[PDB]
Design a protein around this ligand. Structure first.
Ligand SMILES: [Ca+2]
Ligand SMILES: [Ca+2]
Length: 67
């Protein structure tokens, strides 16, 4: 996580909402154990669960800023 604790939208913890986060999203969503993920950063919509809603939020972030 960056300067907050966790950075929602930045799953690979690089400080930016990018297409690499999509990868990490999809890993955990598929049920993979993602080494080097910020597992808390996946809950982008802030519901407490890592779901496709967050994926859609991620797509929102990444489409806007950097893919
Ligand atoms: Ca990122
Ligand atoms: Ca969520």
């Amino acid at each position: 996580g960056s300067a907050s604790n966790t950075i929602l939208g930045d799953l690979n913890d690089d400080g930016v909402v990018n297409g690499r986060d999509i990868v990490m999203m999809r890993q955990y969503l598929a049920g993979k154990t993602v080494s080097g993920i910020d597992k808390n950063a996946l809950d982008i919509n802030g519901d407490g669960a890592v779901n496709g809603r967050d994926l859609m939020e991620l797509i929102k972030k990444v489409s806007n800023n950097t893919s």
